[PDB]
């Protein structure tokens, strides 16, 4: 059972693709080593195709079946509703790919007659035909990275596979409520997307503290989407059907499963037949929920096979971290080998073998880790951080070029307490918004795969709400964290922190002079930058922010706008 079969046709671009970071005075002011920053393009798709194409051998055992029974039992408690066409239309992002049937995202969002007509016809066809494969488009993702020579140079483009806009709206109708509710019901505290960054830290720290001698590891499945089998996808359908659903939803979900999720033909942007998929599509509404469920089932069963004691797992799509009670160094190492062997039997071998870790800060989940800093009183404060290389590289690109959805604002929100987000990202972007007179302009950004419209001037109350008041006064960061930041700045040609402090003092002064929300930004975000610090009291407007639904479910690949 090959994940893909290919015809030899190329994955083709739909527009001009830039490979190299453009030179721009403002981007260069953030980082000068522009030759290290690149975007993936369709040019490397062949290399990706090779990597993602393989045979899946899958052997399920008693542990697998025991866990599946638990999951189905949990699912039976869920009630999920159909969304109306109108409701689903409104979840469509302004930048979603247009339909081949004569309408686009804007038409969907304004409920235009042509769009709604077609959507209704697609729905009727899902109800009447449960068999005919639905077409999909395959594209190469254009995503920005920094080169890492020691690690093979440049990453090939990821491939995304997605159906027509009409179909995407129907997926929302049938499954939006299901994918928004089911993971949590099934795996409880193990579902990672229910947590804001601070809540994720709280979960990991308590798990770590709860063990007599904790041991943790991350498990990296090689090409997770390709490892997902037809039977895995049909099992996901069986799980969805355990919920209390509307009768039409049951039919639609079965049709979507057999016609779209389980596999189908791949067409490139030029209309050429590229091949056929028999694994997870990366650009459907169920990508995140499906990957999370399937990862959880296999991992939980594999923990049992591995004889791991008192396991706590955190699962976000294909990203898995496990914290358990150590049985000793040799014992733990052997258990991880057994865990890997089990995961391999279930179709999910690792890229690189997992390694047992015995320090909390060294455990990396969704490219992030827990670290410790201190508040003004010397109290330890735990917070979520990560290596700043990718965030800075993308921030540079987004300064040089207008992008539909900007990673930098999401990164500031997620990583607000970090030394690097505070001193570099905040200083940089407020200076940019000041230069361009864009302080008042709302921006699109992503949080767990869903697109939000956020006003940069609302950052302080947002940060207080998610991270607490201490986010604006952390100091005495860890040696490992300081060193990681320092190494990154050297690599990328980013000015040193003391230079950013000077720049921040100027940014702060300009914001203060504007009064209102701008002044609150200057006061709270940049208190670290002045000699005589202000007293920061709770921000009034904080409680009035509607953060409903932020950090509650994963929607990567799902074409969701909130």
Ligand X SMILES: Nc1nc2c(ncn2[C@@H]2O[C@H](COP(=O)(O)OP(=O)(O)OP(=O)(O)O)[C@@H](O)[C@H]2O)c(=O)[nH]1
Three-state DSSP class for residue 44: helix
Q: How far is the CB of 186 from ligand X (least distance, A)?
A: 7
Instruction: Report CA-CA distances (Å) from 85 to 120, 130, 164, 166, 396.
Output: 8, 20, 16, 11, 39
State how far the Cα of 11 lies from the Cα of 45, in Å rounded to an integer. 6
Per DSSP (E only), the strands in 56-173 are 136-140, 144-146, 159-162
Among positions 316-345, residues that touch ligand X (CB under 6 A) are: 317-319
Binding mask 192-231 for ligand X (x = CB under 6 A): ----------------------------x--xxx------
Asked if 197 contacts 204 with a C-beta cutoff of 8 angstroms, the reply is: no
User: Minimum distance from CB of 297 to ligand X (Å)?
Assistant: 11
For 539, the token pair is 């921000």
Give dist(CA 130, CA 262) in Å, integer.
Answer: 12
For Mg ion, how many residues bind (rule: CB under 5 A)?
Answer: 4
The answer for residues whose C-beta is within 8 angstroms of residue 532's C-beta and 6 or more apart is: none
* 461 contacts ligand X (rule: CB under 6 A): no
Residue list 217-246, contact with Mg ion (CB under 5 A): 220-221
CA-to-CA distance for 240 and 290, rounded, in angstroms?
10
Residue tagged 């904080």 (tokens): 542
440 binds Mg ion (CB under 5 A): no
Find the binding residues for ligand X in span 383-402 (CB under 6 A).
Answer: 390
Which residues between 540 and 559 bind ligand X (CB under 6 A)?
556-557
Give, as ranges, the residues between 505 and 544 that touch Mg ion (CB under 5 A): none
Q: Is 61 annotated as a binding residue?
A: no
- Check binding of 135 to ligand X (CB under 6 A): no
140-156 b/e with 16+ CB inside 10 Å = b? bbbbbbbbeeeeeeebb
Nearest to 505 by CA among 485, 474, 527: 527
Interaction partner, residue 127 (ligand X, Mg ion, none; CB < 5-8 Å by kind)? none
DSSP SS3 for 267: strand
Q: What is the DSSP string of 412-426?
A: HHHHTTSHHIIIIII
* Residues 299, 303, 308: CA angle, nearest 5 degrees: 155
Q: Which residues inside 41-60 make contact with Mg ion, applying CB under 5 A? A: none
Instruction: Give residue for tokens 């791949």.
Output: 266
Interaction of residue 154 with ligand X, rule CB under 6 A: no
* 190 interacts with ligand X by CB under 6 A: no
Give the span between the Cα atoms of 326 and 311, in whole angstroms: 10
Answer yes or no: is 319 a known binding residue. yes
For ligand X, give the closer residue by CB, 126 or 321.
Answer: 321
Q: How far is it, in rounded angstroms, from Cα 158 to Cα 318? A: 15
Q: Which is nearer to Mg ion, 269 or 390 (CB)?
A: 390
CB under 5 to 8 A by kind: which of Mg ion, ligand X, none does 143 bind?
ligand X
In the complex with Mg ion, which residue's Cβ is closer, 358 or 482? 358
> Could you tell me if 193 and 446 are in contact, meaning their C-beta atoms sit under 8 angstroms apart?
no
Token pair for 476: 């005495």
Q: Can you name the residues that pair with 53 across neighbouring β-strands?
A: none
Instruction: For the CB of residue 221, give the shortest distance to ligand X in the complex, in Å.
Output: 7
**232 assigned ligand-binding residue:** no
Contact 10, 111 (CB under 8 A): no
| Residue 282 contact among ligand X, Mg ion, none, beta carbon within 5 to 8 Å by kind | ligand X
Q: Residue with the closest Cβ to ligand X?
A: 557
Residue 62 contacts which entry, Mg ion, ligand X, none (Cβ below 5-8 A, type-dependent): none
Q: Which of 333, 359, 404, 476 binds Mg ion (CB under 5 A)?
A: 359
Beta strands at 159-162 and 136-140: parallel, antiparallel or unpaired: antiparallel
Of 137 and 294, nearer to Mg ion (C-beta) is 294
Phi/psi of residue 2, each to 5°? -75, 140
Nearest distance in Å: CB 531, ligand X: 35
Interface residue with Mg ion, options 19, 57, 84, 358 (CB under 5 A): 358
| 143 sits near ligand X (criterion: CB under 6 A) | yes
The reply on whether position 158 binds ligand X by CB under 6 A is yes
Contacting range for ligand X; rule: CB under 6 A; set: 260-268, 281-289, 337-345, 474-482? 281-289
Residue 50 binds ligand X (CB under 6 A): no
CA distance 45 to 28: 29
Residue closer to Mg ion by CB (options 53, 90) is 53
Least Å distance between CB 394 and ligand X? 8
Which among ligand X, Mg ion, none contacts residue 359 (Cβ within 5 to 8 A by kind)?
Mg ion
Q: Does 160 bind ligand X (CB under 6 A)?
A: yes
- 134 neighbors 122 (Cβ within 8 angstroms): no
DSSP for 333-376 reads HHHHHHHHHHHHHTT--BSS----B-SGGG--BTTEEEEEEE-T
In the region spanning residues 68 to 87, those forming contacts with ligand X, defined by CB under 6 A, are 69-70, 73-74
Known binding-site residue numbers for Mg(2+): 220, 318-319
> What residues make contact with Mg ion under the rule CB under 5 A?
220-221, 358-359
> What residues make contact with ligand X under the rule CB under 6 A?
69-70, 73-74, 143, 155, 158, 160, 220, 223-225, 282-283, 287, 291, 317-319, 351, 367, 390, 446, 449, 556-557
Known binding-site residue numbers: 220, 318-319
């Amino acid at each position: 059972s090959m994940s893909y079969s290919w015809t030899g046709a190329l994955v083709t671009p739909c527009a001009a693709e830039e490979q190299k970071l453009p030179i721009n005075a403002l981007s260069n002011s953030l980082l000068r080593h522009h030759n290290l920053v690149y975007s993936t393009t369709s040019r490397s798709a062949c290399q990706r195709q090779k990597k993602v194409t393989f045979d899946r051998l899958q052997v399920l055992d008693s542990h697998y079946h025991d866990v599946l029974k638990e999951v189905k039992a949990a699912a039976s408690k869920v009630k999920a509703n159909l969304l109306s066409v109108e409701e689903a239309c409104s979840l469509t992002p302004p930048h979603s790919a247009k339909s081949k049937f004569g309408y686009g995202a804007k038409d969907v969002r304004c409920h235009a007659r042509k769009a709604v007509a077609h959507i209704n016809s697609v729905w009727k066809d899902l109800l009447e035909d449960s068999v005919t494969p639905i077409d999909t488009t395959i594209m190469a993702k254009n995503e920005v990275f920094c080169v890492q020579p020691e690690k093979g140079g440049r990453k090939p483009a990821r491939l995304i596979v997605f159906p027509d806009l009409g179909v995407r709206v129907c997926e929302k109708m049938a499954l939006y409520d299901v994918v928004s509710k089911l993971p949590l019901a099934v795996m409880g505290s193990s579902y990672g997307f229910q947590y804001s960054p601070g809540q994720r830290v709280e979960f990991l720290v308590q798990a770590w503290k709860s063990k007599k001698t904790p041991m943790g590891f991350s498990y990296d499945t090689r090409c997770f989407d390709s490892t997902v089998t037809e039977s895995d996808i049909r099992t996901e359908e069986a799980i969805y059907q355990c919920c209390d659903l509307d009768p039409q939803a049951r039919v639609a979900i079965k049709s979507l499963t057999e016609r779209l999720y389980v596999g189908g033909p791949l067409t490139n942007s030029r209309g050429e037949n590229c091949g056929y998929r028999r694994c997870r599509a990366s650009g459907v509404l169920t990508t995140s929920c499906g990957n999370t469920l399937t990862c959880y089932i296999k991992a939980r069963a594999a923990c049992r096979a591995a004889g791991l004691q008192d396991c706590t797992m955190l699962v976000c799509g294909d990203d898995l971290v496990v914290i358990c009670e150590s049985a000793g160094v040799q014992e733990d190492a052997a258990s991880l080998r057994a865990f890997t062997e089990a995961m391999t039997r279930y179709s999910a071998p690792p890229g690189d073998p997992p390694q047992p870790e015995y320090d909390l800060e060294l455990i990396t989940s969704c490219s992030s880790n827990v670290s410790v800093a201190h508040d003004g009183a010397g109290k330890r404060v735990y917070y979520l951080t990560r290596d700043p290389t990718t965030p800075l590289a993308r921030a540079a690109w987004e300064t040089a070029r207008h992008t539909p959805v900007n990673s930098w604002l999401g990164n500031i929100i997620m990583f607000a307490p970090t030394l690097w987000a505070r001193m570099i990202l905040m200083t940089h972007f407020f200076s940019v918004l000041i230069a361009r007179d864009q302080l008042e302009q709302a921006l699109n950004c992503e949080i767990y795969g869903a697109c939000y419209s956020i006003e940069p001037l609302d950052l302080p109350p947002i940060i207080q709400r998610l991270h607490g008041l201490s986010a604006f006064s952390l100091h005495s960061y860890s040696p490992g964290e300081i060193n990681r930041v320092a190494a990154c700045l050297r690599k990328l040609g980013v000015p040193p922190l003391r230079a950013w402090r000077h720049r921040a003092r100027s940014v702060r002064a300009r914001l203060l002079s504007r009064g209102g929300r701008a002044a609150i930004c200057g006061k709270y975000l940049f208190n670290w930058a002045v000699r005589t610090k202000l007293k920061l009291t709770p921000i009034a407007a904080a409680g009035r922010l509607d953060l409903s639904g932020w950090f509650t479910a994963g929607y990567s690949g799902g074409d969701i706008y909130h």
